Scaffold this active site. Structure first.
Site, short mmCIF file in Angstrom:
data_model
loop_
_atom_site.label_atom_id
_atom_site.label_comp_id
_atom_site.label_asym_id
_atom_site.label_seq_id
_atom_site.Cartn_x
_atom_site.Cartn_y
_atom_site.Cartn_z
N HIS A 39 47.43 31.02 43.49
CA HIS A 39 46.61 30.18 42.61
C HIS A 39 46.65 30.63 41.16
O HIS A 39 46.08 29.93 40.31
CB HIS A 39 45.18 29.98 43.15
CG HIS A 39 44.30 31.20 43.10
ND1 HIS A 39 43.58 31.64 44.19
CD2 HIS A 39 43.98 32.03 42.08
CE1 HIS A 39 42.87 32.70 43.85
NE2 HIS A 39 43.10 32.96 42.57
N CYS A 67 40.34 38.33 42.08
CA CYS A 67 41.38 37.82 42.97
C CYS A 67 42.62 38.70 42.91
O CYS A 67 42.99 39.23 41.85
CB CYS A 67 41.74 36.39 42.58
SG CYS A 67 40.37 35.31 42.81
N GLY A 121 37.75 37.35 38.32
CA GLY A 121 38.83 38.23 37.96
C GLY A 121 39.25 39.17 39.07
O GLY A 121 40.24 39.89 38.91
#
Lengths: 298, 298
Positions: free
Chosen positions: B41, B139, B137
């Site tokens: 993503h 991820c 942040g």
């Protein structure tokens, strides 16, 4: 979102852990620059000055992984031994030796035979013990906090007390609390709950959407401290209120309004509810711990 | 003695964390050998095959501390991106990609902008979510276990669900549970309590001297599972009984005798007592976690 007991990344400390053996006693040491720090009780088999005068550099076997470090000097500093070695640790981080206050938290890197086993968070209790997780061989494991690139060492593990809680020193070798590195009947004194930390954790709960314990009421500092005394909670000071400022601002709940929630929880319990997944009031998160985790500093 | 939520030492993983930026999206990646793994993503600004065909190597900025890594190739593997870089990570540990089962635990190294922030333990829930602590942040942060010198990576963080619990993939990019890396109304399904883990934790409690919940009774597996169903606990299997063998031997309390204690605790509560400092039954410690901590493997 979420809220966990969160330790600092332990890598910078892992590179400092060594094994120290004297006689048949093996424990952990901390290798910074050309010095290895370890508990002086490694030389026991109870006047430590006599015991150390009887030792020589060659009586201390220091192993850093697969490498044996040669001891070129030794001295005692309070309850720690300083073993000077011929090689400076190339992995030495920027570091400081800082003594902490009861109520403050730190990360523990539990080690055995110089090898790190796990990392967890804990608090210095008001009675100067820590509720750690240590087995035989863990002496010399250290506690620390990390700020930017700097490791602030605050604890070295020495002793298990009869109730299974733990006692140790700062890295200057000075014990936290009225404990000694000898065989006595010493025992932890009565403990209290760290009020400012409970309030911090209630703010963490609000930030994470647990609001059921909130109310419209506000108390006074003196009126709250009357209840804190009754429930074996530490007094709350104006400094504590100021320290909680950032969390009070972020949530819009004044500290003394949160104190009214704590009063109610103390007098009535939780009525089968939970806060951040706990059925008890948690006191091992400082205001800084909450800000750090509900803001994301690295 | 003592019993803590204990993570594995994170050093071996810290040396693998990098920052990955594409467009205005920045998150974390895992640098092993000459590949950086990150959530796909990162390329969003919802057909990922189209989105990636439109990208070039130069659209991916990879930073390992103060060093920018040059991307020489890119491919998609399920929900992860593999960015081939021109330099192999000199700090790559021995590693494996292993997918875990609901009920199993792992350590999470929460990171922001490629920088490790903290380490904590958690369990894969029966509903395939994790109750993590993640902010914007995070991820690309990873979960892992360590055995001897080998890092078994099992989780990469992708999504926060509406209840604030977390969902992610194995390191092959395959989601745990019925979750996706897109904007839907997806939500965690109903969860259950991990029975074998609760029993493991009761054994940890006994090893640490909490015995008040013990009784002389023993139940049958079928009779216990009738009660487990009523209280939203997972069924207990003969394999679970066998896995608990070592702890049953060490304490001398048969598994089905401990099951009688659990039955009573479920039907009557704790009557104001605590077990290992908790007023709830804890289910995020596996039998291995208990053995590891009440025996001292490094």
């Amino acid at each position: 979102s979420g809220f966990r007991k969160m330790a600092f990344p332990s890598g910078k400390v892992e590179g400092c852990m060594v094994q120290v053996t004297c006689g048949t006693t093996t424990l952990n040491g901390l290798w910074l620059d050309d010095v290895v720090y370890c508990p002086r009780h490694v030389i026991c088999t109870p006047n430590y000055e006599d015991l150390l005068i009887r030792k020589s550099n060659h009586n201390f076997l220091v192993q850093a992984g697969n490498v044996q470090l040669r001891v070129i000097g030794h001295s005692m500093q309070n309850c720690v031994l300083k073993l000077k070695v011929d090689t400076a640790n190339p992995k030495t981080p920027k570091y400081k030796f800082v003594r902490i206050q009861p109520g403050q938290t730190f990360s523990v890197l539990a080690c055995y035979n110089g090898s790190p086993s796990g990392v967890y968070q804990c608090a210095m209790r008001p009675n100067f013990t820590i509720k750690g997780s240590f087995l035989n061989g863990s002496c010399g494991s250290v506690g620390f906090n990390i700020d930017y690139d700097c490791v602030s060492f605050c604890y070295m593990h020495h002793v298990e007390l009869p109730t299974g809680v733990h006692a140790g020193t700062d890295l200057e070798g000075n014990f936290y609390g009225p404990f000694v590195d000898r065989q006595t009947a010493q025992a932890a004194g009565t403990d209290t709950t760290i009020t400012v930390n409970v309030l911090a954790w209630l703010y963490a709960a609000v930030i994470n959407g647990d609001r059921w314990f909130l109310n419209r009421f506000t108390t006074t500092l003196n009126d709250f401290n009357l209840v804190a005394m009754k429930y074996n909670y530490e007094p709350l000071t104006q400094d504590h209120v100021d320290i909680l400022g950032p969390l009070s601002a972020q949530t819009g709940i004044a500290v003394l309004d949160m104190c009214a929630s704590l009063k109610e929880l103390l007098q009535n319990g939780m009525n089968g509810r939970t806060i951040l997944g706990s059925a008890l009031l948690e006191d091992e998160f400082t205001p800084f711990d909450v800000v750090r985790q509900c803001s994301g500093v690295t």
